[PDB]
Amino acid sequence: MEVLYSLSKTLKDARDKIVEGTLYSNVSDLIQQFNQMIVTMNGNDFQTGGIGNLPIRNWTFDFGLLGTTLLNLDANYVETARTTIEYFIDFIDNVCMDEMVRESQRNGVAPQSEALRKLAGIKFKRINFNNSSEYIENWNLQNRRQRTGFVFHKPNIFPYSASFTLNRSQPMHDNLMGTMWLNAGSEIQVAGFDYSCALNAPANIQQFEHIVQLRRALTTATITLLPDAERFSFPRVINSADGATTWFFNPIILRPNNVEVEFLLNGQIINTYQARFGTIVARNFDTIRLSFQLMRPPNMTPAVNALFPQAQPFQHHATVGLTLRIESAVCESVLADANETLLANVTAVRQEYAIPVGPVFPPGMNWTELITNYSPSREDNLQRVFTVASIRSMLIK
Amino acid sequence: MEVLYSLSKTLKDARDKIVEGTLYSNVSDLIQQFNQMIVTMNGNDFQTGGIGNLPIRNWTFDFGLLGTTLLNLDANYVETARTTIEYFIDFIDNVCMDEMVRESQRNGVAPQSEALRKLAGIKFKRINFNNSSEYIENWNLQNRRQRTGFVFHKPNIFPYSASFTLNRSQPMHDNLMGTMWLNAGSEIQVAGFDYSCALNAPANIQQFEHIVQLRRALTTATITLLPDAERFSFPRVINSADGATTWFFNPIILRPNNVEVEFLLNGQIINTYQARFGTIVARNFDTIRLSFQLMRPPNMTPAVNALFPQAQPFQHHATVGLTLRIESAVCESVLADANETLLANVTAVRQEYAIPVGPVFPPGMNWTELITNYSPSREDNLQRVFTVASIRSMLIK
Amino acid sequence: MEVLYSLSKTLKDARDKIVEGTLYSNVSDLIQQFNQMIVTMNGNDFQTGGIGNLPIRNWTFDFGLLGTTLLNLDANYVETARTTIEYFIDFIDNVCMDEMVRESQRNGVAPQSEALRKLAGIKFKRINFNNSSEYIENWNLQNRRQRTGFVFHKPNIFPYSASFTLNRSQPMHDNLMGTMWLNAGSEIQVAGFDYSCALNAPANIQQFEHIVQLRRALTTATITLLPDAERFSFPRVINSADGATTWFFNPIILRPNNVEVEFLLNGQIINTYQARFGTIVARNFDTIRLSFQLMRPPNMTPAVNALFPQAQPFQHHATVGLTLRIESAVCESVLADANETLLANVTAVRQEYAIPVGPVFPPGMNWTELITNYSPSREDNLQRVFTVASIRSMLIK
Amino acid sequence: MEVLYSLSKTLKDARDKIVEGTLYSNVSDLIQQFNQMIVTMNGNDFQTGGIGNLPIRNWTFDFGLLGTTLLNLDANYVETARTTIEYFIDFIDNVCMDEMVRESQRNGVAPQSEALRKLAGIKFKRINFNNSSEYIENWNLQNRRQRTGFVFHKPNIFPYSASFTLNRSQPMHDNLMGTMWLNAGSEIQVAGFDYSCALNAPANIQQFEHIVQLRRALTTATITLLPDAERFSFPRVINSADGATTWFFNPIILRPNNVEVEFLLNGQIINTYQARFGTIVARNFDTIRLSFQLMRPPNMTPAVNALFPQAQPFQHHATVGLTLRIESAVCESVLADANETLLANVTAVRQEYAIPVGPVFPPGMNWTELITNYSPSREDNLQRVFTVASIRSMLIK
Amino acid sequence: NLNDNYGITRTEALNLIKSNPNMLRNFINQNNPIIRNRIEQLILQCKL
């Protein structure tokens, strides 16, 4: 697999550096690398495909070396190099495509794709050129077992989940109290709502708490925290928990007061922020506690007084909310993002050829079900396929 | 780790073959391989332990080679040998304990316990003696990955589970119908029952079914299928499913007629045996679907007639049972047995030193919980510790 | 067949002993044997299959000898070893399957499977390596008789037969007396019942006797004898002898008094035990005579007196039972066990390919019918296929 | 006796390895060993038998050595080798029988059967070949001061005993409380019972306890623990303890709540498991202490209420049980098994020739009374006869 | 069950799949237990 990445790297460098008019001084080491690669790959026969509708393809390499005599590259050199390079790029593209479509319940990180298995032998170890990209670097580290880190922008650590709990319920759903939340992508939108606006609560302060469990610990994460959760701040009709009836939610957005966010790693306090909105940092954390309070206003103009009575109906429904974006983070295990395209590449390659639903992944490689159960076997296989997709992106888009 | 097995094998052969009076032709090759072990283990210092109560101990190797000129072993030869082999066996035993106790979640197959990590190095490749034991050769096949197979006498594949389902129920629990089963070790005892004796069932036939999902598919298994499950053939009182009340039932055992046993592999009907008791065999199966019927007896002696009335009371309750013993099987993944002492050795080594609960294994290695959820990382760690326990049991019984 | 076993043994020992870094002194003899195997099999053509769905295949051998100028084996040696040994293992697997799927009513010992028949020539005796396994050793001894014996753990020598006889009976089945039994696998469970509790028997003692006729003599057997046949100690309703009606059965378990167990060979008593339970032995026995008695208890507490009246009704029926497990034994002929998977392998190989039922074995290798009718031709064919499966299991699992 | 195991080892190896067509390199060292054995045994008059019905036999050896000038074994070679090997096998058989049929109160590990004394002589130490089998391995390790171990599958540690202790009784036997138990083989089956269903018990929870006292310690034992001991879950008519009257027993089986199992070595709690059925482990234990509670169900359907009244009659007796099977264990002292066949072998050899009842073993070698009192001298003699039985079984079956 | 235990030819298997009375009656004439048991099961299912 390191050899596969080296193949992709040398092909990309060849296609970017063997161009008309460039000096040999700029491509001498590249020509040496490419010649070593040619000498190694000559006289071999790889087979690729045979899973799903990805077609069988046989690759045979008999390509002559590249010249090492010209002071300054000219045309003909470029066309010879190119007629080699297109064949090699097609080979590597098909190898990566066939690798991304195979799983393994046991020994995930090891290669699949008998072509790639052959590449993983002792013969092809002389192709090792450079291991510079983030994914190959972390792959090398894990094989060299030690700390790994993937930096993400908007990591979708949070499986999609829209749901609510009620700490006070009636069959008529006239006087409720509780919390609602949407975790999605890198967003937590939580809203604590009371219909009585904390009439009988201790000191007219109603406490709300929401615990979110990341499936993998994030690290050095910039998080933007704002009040007034948007999605739960307008009229709504929500079905009851069992789905029998439906109830009405008619917000009036009080301030969230003395809020408190705790970022926790393995059940202990790692960071705490009280009444501190804007940009914050979570040093290293695996769970989030968002604890806030709906505090009744003691002073009211007649408008607010009419809004919040002491009586039975409770027409308008007090609530507060928090919005929490993970703008960026660092994770030890590979995850999908909004910047990278690796999940898109792997999912597209599976969908294009209609691979049968495999042993380990969920059907369709949907990220919500993939991440809600993110077992170590899935993590191994996911790192493998993501690394292969990143290798492929060096040549094919 | 193959190096560790080779060390165990060569030390065992030294303990066995190097005995007073034996011909030197019997042990020439063994002595040569022993000298290779000594010389290749010279100078390399090892550290073992430091987890739980297992004490940190340091090993250093500076030993002289066993003589070769002697044409017949005598007291001096064997006693110098035994002085060396005692220390070597102690080292191997501590390494095996240490690798048992430690655990990992990613890359479970690879070694832990830096003693074994260093042994996996390339310098210690010249100790590889031969890999003949079933566990070590399955390990070698997995490393060289191919189709591994373990022959298990009475595997405890089934999680412990005693329970029931009521397809007809009411708070008086006076007229019930349903199934009730025990799965334990290698035994499935399943009994369907009905209080009305299929009075109002169509054709006086009450169908019963039971689906038992193994976690790993057993290959070439021999199964003893008998009627009239024992544990569900005596009168007993059972707590309700809710756990509020308790209901009594008084079995009358009946012939289970047109019984069928299907053996499935991912919804793939692989074997079917209809009305055939005694020993049977399954080629390959991951689920067992038992089915049977309670047929009301069309002709009735007055005793049985009074026993089964058409009115409501139903003071005796008709039942039909089945008993399924997996006497032997072949499984790709490692499992505990009634014939093997690997789980016991690993658990004893963990308990004797009171290792803290790992990130992977369940607390105390309770087999029921370990096998209820038997994910591939857990399987990999289980195979590693089982193979280390085979290596240890070769010497320290 | 000795040649076939020698092939399997040398391939197994090659796969095990020829590993990286092993001294050539460890494997010199094995390499010599392997080279003899190569030279003997070289320049030949075998054909395997053509029955059922087992498809025809053709094997051709042109392999080079393994090197010998190496003091310590390295990786590049084991790769040539792979390329040879994998092909050889596949060839052996298909030969063994082909031999298992065939039959012959006459001269069944001589090999079927023209591939194996060719292997049984004169050019291939030079491959004979060593016949260490129990099955191959007994094959040699039987083919030139010395006294032989396979040691079996819990051998299923009985055929599955559960039934009952009534020494006394009525059309209304109010007052019965007789015996019931279940012989299954290595378990005999026999319960003699009397509905009058031996009220009118001579001296209030009723005598029960059960005869079990082994299909083949067992030697040095270990037998666990206990009282209280489990299967016949709960209420039942049983279809009558004619099948017209069903009769109720309601045990009350008295102990069996002066129980005698006689192990006989060819009509003469070899062993006899009286009131002995727990483990016992049977030297060399072909039949078991279990005699026991139902003695009406002289002194009777009010409860038991209420149980047993002197009038006809007899709501409760006295019974006394025995259980008998042949834990292990030694049989001159071959039988299935609970520790060995030979029968499972044979049946699975026949089932996967759907072989037409041949002259000798019953449909689907039904072990119950096969042991019920165990004529010498059937025995010889069974021994052949079992030893072939033993050979196959050394390499394929 | 090491010499005897050496003779048996080399003779089994000769019957195996020396066959037609084998290379001479396959058997060079074995032929050297055989020649050494022949030269040492030539011109030595041995005598065997002379006890019971074992006939006196005289053995003399003048045999030629096995030749070597060939380069691949042929038919004639194996003919002469067979002529020698059959005689030697007969000699070993007779020596083993003679040694098994003897005993000694003083110095039971020393060899009886003067042939074996002569073998123990200084001259014959030249024959000592190797010590590979488990039994001879343990024999050497205990002849020296080391720790031995025998792995057993279902060891019959328990001497057979079925009985009961009544903690409350009276002549009508209409209100009893106590426990019944059957220890047999590797099974414990203990059922506590109470006729009042813990009506008057303190907090309606009757505590039953049963302590089982092994005769020898066990190590790393897998134990299948299940509830609802089967064989005491159905009506019985049990004689009184003294044997005067007979009392009726009529179970209704509850569940044993808060079961606790303590495995104790020397009276200290080595292991403890609470309410954890299924497979468990005991790393070291000389006693097993089971303690379970019959709790009267607080809530109750009318049917169970009818079963259990507050008054005296008590026509149904509430019972709770536990089954505990030692599936596979390890012990420092030899025992009989379900797997091994040494007790049967020695007993058969003794009673075939009708050896007189000796001083140390019981009459007829019944395991129950052999293990009910298992003194050190009896242990030594049992170990000697068992190892010699293994020596015999290496050849003769 | 029937194909696995009693090895059947392509023609007989295809006709049994097609529910051909010719091969069904042929098998009952052979009197094999699997078919006998199934036909008896159906006749029992006709109990009303």
**Half-sphere exposure at residue C7, Cβ-oriented, CA atoms within 13 angstroms:** 30
Crossing angle (nearest 10°) for helices B342-353 and B376-393: 90
In the block, which residue shows the tokens 């020396």?
A: D18
Cα gap B54→A277, rounded to integer Å:
49
User: Quick check: C351 and E4 CB within 8 A?
Assistant: yes
* CB neighbours of residue D178 within 10 Å: 17
Cα gap B169→C99, rounded to integer Å:
56
Judge residue D362's burial from the number of C-beta atoms within 10 Å of its C-beta, 0-12 exposed, 13-18 middle, 19 or more buried.
Answer: middle
B325, containing H or E segment: strand B317-331
Q: Is C290 helix (H, G, I), strand (E, B) or coil?
A: strand
User: Quick check: D304 and B248 CB within 8 A?
Assistant: yes
Touching partners of E (3+ C-beta pairs < 8 Å): B, C
Phi and psi angles of residue E44, each rounded to the nearest 5 degrees, phi first: -65, -40
In the block, which residue shows the tokens 């994998």?
A: C86
Residues 6 or more apart in contact with residue C212 via CB below 8 angstroms: C158, C183, C188, C287, C288, C290
For residue D300, the chain B residues in CB contact (below 8 A) are 245-246
In the block, which residue shows the tokens 């048992």?
A: B100
Residues 6 or more apart in contact with residue B42 via CB below 8 angstroms: B61, B62, B63
- Angle, vertex CA A104, rays to CA A100 and CA A108, nearest 5: 85
Cα gap B227→B219, rounded to integer Å:
24
Cα gap A387→A143, rounded to integer Å:
13
Distance from CA of B2 to the nearest CA of D (A): 21
Binding residues of C: 153, 266, 286
Residues 6 or more apart in contact with residue A354 via CB below 8 angstroms: A52, A53
User: Quick check: D16 and C301 CB within 8 A?
Assistant: no
Long-range contacts of A129-133 (CB under 8 A, 24+ apart): A129/A6, A129/A9, A129/A10, A129/A33, A130/A6, A130/A9, A131/A2, A131/A5, A131/A6, A132/A9, A133/A5, A133/A390, A133/A391, A133/A394
B78, containing H or E segment: helix B75-101
Distance from CA of A113 to the nearest CA of B (A): 14
Contact E17, E9 (CB under 8 A): no
User: Quick check: E44 and B275 CB within 8 A?
Assistant: no
Cα gap A318→A306, rounded to integer Å:
13
C-alpha pair distances (Å), A105 with each of A377, B146, B241: 6, 14, 36
**CA dihedral (A106, A110, A115, A121) positive or negative:** negative
Residues 6 or more apart in contact with residue D83 via CB below 8 angstroms: none
For residue B230, the chain D residues in CB contact (below 8 A) are 230
Contact A305, A197 (CB under 8 A): no
User: Quick check: C363 and E6 CB within 8 A?
Assistant: yes
Beta strands B317-331; B251-253: pairing state = parallel
* CB neighbours of residue C20 within 10 Å: 17
C-alpha pair distances (Å), D114 with each of B370, D118, D356: 56, 6, 18
In the block, which residue shows the tokens 């171990």?
A: D149
Residues 6 or more apart in contact with residue B121 via CB below 8 angstroms: none
Classify C204 in phi/psi space as left (phi over 0), alpha (psi -120 to 50) or beta: left
Nearest residue of C to residue D75, measured between CA atoms: C125
* CB neighbours of residue B75 within 10 Å: 9
Of B355, B379, B366, residue with least CA distance to A375: B379
Chain C interface disruption, residue of B28, B130, B189, B299, most C CBs within 10 A: B130
Distance from CA of C15 to the nearest CA of B (A): 8
**DSSP calls for A224-268:** EEEES-GGGSS-EEEE-TTSSSEEEE-EEEPPPEEEEEEEEETTE
User: Quick check: D126 and B72 CB within 8 A?
Assistant: yes
Cα gap E32→E26, rounded to integer Å:
10
Tokens representing A77 are 């050199």
Q: What is the largest CA-CA distance in chain B?
A: 96
Contact D172, C301 (CB under 8 A): yes
For residue A318, the Cα-to-chain-centroid distance in whole angstroms is 36
Contact D303, B247 (CB under 8 A): yes
User: Quick check: B204 and E38 CB within 8 A?
Assistant: no
Beta strands A251-253; A317-331: pairing state = parallel
Tokens representing B336 are 């505990």
Q: Is A4 helix (H, G, I), strand (E, B) or coil?
A: helix
Strand partners of residue C161: C183
C326, containing H or E segment: strand C317-331
Q: Choose the closest CB to D235 out of C2, C154, C253.
A: C253
Of D153, D270, D159, D280, residue with least CA distance to D213: D159
DSSP code for B56: P
Does D325 lie at the interface with C, CB-CB under 8 angstroms?
no
User: Quick check: E37 and B272 CB within 8 A?
Assistant: no
For residue A335, the Cα-to-chain-centroid distance in whole angstroms is 3
Contact D127, D36 (CB under 8 A): yes
Binding residues of B for Ca(2+): 266, 286
Q: Choose the closest CB to D156 out of C220, C279, C282.
A: C279
Distance from CA of B164 to the nearest CA of C (A): 21
Residues 6 or more apart in contact with residue C59 via CB below 8 angstroms: C45, C46, C47, C48, C91, C94, C115
Cα gap A46→A57, rounded to integer Å:
8
Beta strands D236-239; D268-274: pairing state = unpaired
C-alpha pair distances (Å), D205 with each of C108, D300, D316: 67, 16, 18
For residue C141, the Cα-to-chain-centroid distance in whole angstroms is 20
User: Quick check: E1 and B258 CB within 8 A?
Assistant: no
Alpha helices in C62-128 (DSSP H): 75-101, 114-119
B 80-139 residues with CB below 8 A of D? Answer: none
* CB neighbours of residue A299 within 10 Å: 6
DSSP code for D33: H
Q: Is E15 helix (H, G, I), strand (E, B) or coil?
A: helix
Residues 6 or more apart in contact with residue C373 via CB below 8 angstroms: C362
User: Quick check: A109 and B110 CB within 8 A?
Assistant: no
Judge residue C18's burial from the number of C-beta atoms within 10 Å of its C-beta, 0-12 exposed, 13-18 middle, 19 or more buried.
Answer: buried
Residues 6 or more apart in contact with residue A277 via CB below 8 angstroms: A225, A226, A227, A259
- Angle, vertex CA B106, rays to CA B100 and CA B110, nearest 5: 50
Of B212, B216, B179, residue with least CA distance to B194: B179
For residue C168, the Cα-to-chain-centroid distance in whole angstroms is 36
The residue length of chain E stands at 48
The residue length of chain C stands at 397
Phi and psi angles of residue C258, each rounded to the nearest 5 degrees, phi first: 35, 50
**Cα Rg for chain E, rounded, in angstroms?**
11
Long-range contacts of B196-202 (CB under 8 A, 24+ apart): B196/B314, B197/B294, B197/B296, B197/B308, B197/B314, B197/B318, B198/B294, B198/B295, B198/B296, B198/B318, B199/B296, B199/B310, B201/B296
Distance from CA of C276 to the nearest CA of D (A): 9
Residues 6 or more apart in contact with residue D73 via CB below 8 angstroms: D18, D19, D20, D21, D22, D23, D24, D27
The answer to whether the annotation marks A153 as part of a ligand binding site is yes
Q: Is B220 helix (H, G, I), strand (E, B) or coil?
A: strand
Beta strands C257-265; C268-274: pairing state = antiparallel
Of A384, A361, A280, A369, residue with least CA distance to A325: A280
Distance from CA of C268 to the nearest CA of B (A): 31
User: Quick check: D328 and B338 CB within 8 A?
Assistant: yes
| Buried-exposed string D305-337: b where 16+ CB fall within 10 A, e elsewhere | eebbeeeeebebbbbbbbbbbbbbbbbbbbbbb
D85, containing H or E segment: helix D75-100
Cα gap A393→A339, rounded to integer Å:
14
What single-letter amino acid sits at A170? Answer: Q
Crossing angle (nearest 10°) for helices C2-17 and C75-101: 150
Residues 6 or more apart in contact with residue A334 via CB below 8 angstroms: A135, A138, A150, A342, A379, A382, A383, A386
Contact C135, C384 (CB under 8 A): no
Judge residue B110's burial from the number of C-beta atoms within 10 Å of its C-beta, 0-12 exposed, 13-18 middle, 19 or more buried.
Answer: middle
The residue length of chain B stands at 397
Contact D87, D386 (CB under 8 A): no
Cα gap A346→A392, rounded to integer Å:
10
Q: What is the largest CA-CA distance in chain D?
A: 97
Contact A30, A129 (CB under 8 A): no
Number of H helices, E strands in chain C: 9, 14
Judge residue A21's burial from the number of C-beta atoms within 10 Å of its C-beta, 0-12 exposed, 13-18 middle, 19 or more buried.
Answer: exposed
Cα gap B85→B12, rounded to integer Å:
9
Residues 6 or more apart in contact with residue D300 via CB below 8 angstroms: B245, B246, D308
* CB neighbours of residue A86 within 10 Å: 12
Cα gap B14→B127, rounded to integer Å:
14
Residues 6 or more apart in contact with residue A313 via CB below 8 angstroms: A174
Strand partners of residue C249: C236
Cα gap A285→A218, rounded to integer Å:
6
Tokens representing C34 are 């392997």
What single-letter amino acid sits at A164? Answer: F
User: Quick check: B301 and C351 CB within 8 A?
Assistant: no
A 368-387 residues with CB below 8 A of B? Answer: 375-377, 379-380
DSSP code for A65: -
Cα gap A365→A345, rounded to integer Å:
11
Contact D275, B162 (CB under 8 A): no
In the block, which residue shows the tokens 């087992």?
A: C54
User: Quick check: E8 and C354 CB within 8 A?
Assistant: yes
In the block, which residue shows the tokens 């298994």?
A: B221
Contact C65, C48 (CB under 8 A): no
Does D74 lie at the interface with C, CB-CB under 8 angstroms?
no
Q: Choose the closest CB to E41 out of B204, B258, B271.
A: B258
Cα gap B373→B361, rounded to integer Å:
10
DSSP code for B51: B
**Cα Rg for chain B, rounded, in angstroms?**
29
Tokens representing B117 are 């990590």
For residue C214, the Cα-to-chain-centroid distance in whole angstroms is 13
Contact A157, A329 (CB under 8 A): yes
Distance from CA of E9 to the nearest CA of B (A): 19
C-alpha pair distances (Å), B226 with each of B189, B260, B261, B279, B323: 10, 12, 11, 9, 5
Cα gap A318→A275, rounded to integer Å:
20
**DSSP calls for C196-228:** TSSSSSGGGEEEEEEEEEEEEEEEEEEEEEEES
Nearest residue of C to residue D339, measured between CA atoms: C153
Contact C75, C87 (CB under 8 A): no
Touching partners of B (3+ C-beta pairs < 8 Å): A, C, D, E
Nearest residue of A to residue B105, measured between CA atoms: A376
Of B29, D30, B25, D26, residue with least CA distance to C25: B29
Chain B interface disruption, residue of E4, E6, E40, E43, most B CBs within 10 A: E4
Q: Is B156 helix (H, G, I), strand (E, B) or coil?
A: coil
Of B349, B329, B321, B179, residue with least CA distance to B259: B321
Tokens representing C202 are 């001579």
Nearest residue of E to residue C349, measured between CA atoms: E4
Q: Choose the closest CB to A377 out of B110, B145, B377.
A: B377
Cα gap D84→D128, rounded to integer Å:
19
Nearest residue of B to residue E40, measured between CA atoms: B258
Judge residue A81's burial from the number of C-beta atoms within 10 Å of its C-beta, 0-12 exposed, 13-18 middle, 19 or more buried.
Answer: buried
